[PDB]
Ligand SMILES: [Fe+3]
């Protein structure tokens with residue numbers, strides 16, 4: 001019973017979560033090249049976490065009677081100017097993902113799609129946590 | 144001690160294994176849309192299997208002192224004309240992946256990169272198995 005509009009929006013987001021996963025893997029390639037096994041391992045966990053986010057969107061879309069369409073994934077950046085600069089790029093990206101979700105939340109509220117509104121709440125909470133995990137990294141590394 | 148040429152070839156293949164994973168997920172979107180939960184679940188296992196193939200290339204490249212660079216992933220097809228037509232596309236794709244590996248095997252033999260030659264042998268064996276798993280599906284579904 002999902003509108004085509006809310007379905008398109010959730011499919012767009014599914015593809016956004018796939019690119020999120022690819023960017024984070026890209027960041028690991030930078031960390032691994034620079035010898036930072038530990039930051040690379042962190043980025044690889046994150047890349048796997050975003051994939052399960054994308055599959056939660058995948059399965060919810062089919063539960064509501066929609067179809068998934070996978071789009072082209074753009075080439076991510078492969079180099080930053082140091083650790084801090086990578087993680088600040090991570091944080092900026094997370095915040096873009098959070099705004100992306102909030103616009104779906106708004107459209108769901110508009111259409112009174114109470115099931116979608118409830119589905120997204122988990123992703124709102126998890127992005128709050130992830131944004132703050134990156135802030136704690138940046139603070140721990142300060143100066 | 145890997146040549147730039149053998150490194151580029153293994154990085155190209157890493158990106159080929161990522162697209163392999165995306166094509167297989169695409170095939171699942173087709174199966175799931177058509178109600179075939181079972182063929183979709185098969186394609187999702189396969190997509191996850193190719194990802195670990197791509198990460199074996201990822202970690203081997205760094206073990207030999209190279210860097211990974213992630214490229215853009217093209218949009219896969221999202222529709223086939225039935226089950227059999229999907230799996231025949233799967234088989235044709237596997238065979239392209241096998242030829243891709245054999246050309247790396249050849250370049251490794253040329254450069255007497257005995258470590259790469261041994262690394263790829265696992266992927267030669269696994270593609271033989273996967274190609275035959277798809278043939279057994281096609282035969283079981285015949286007419
Ligand atoms: Fe996410």
Ligand SMILES: [Fe+3]
Pocket residue numbers: 160163192193196240
């Ligand atoms: Fe593979």
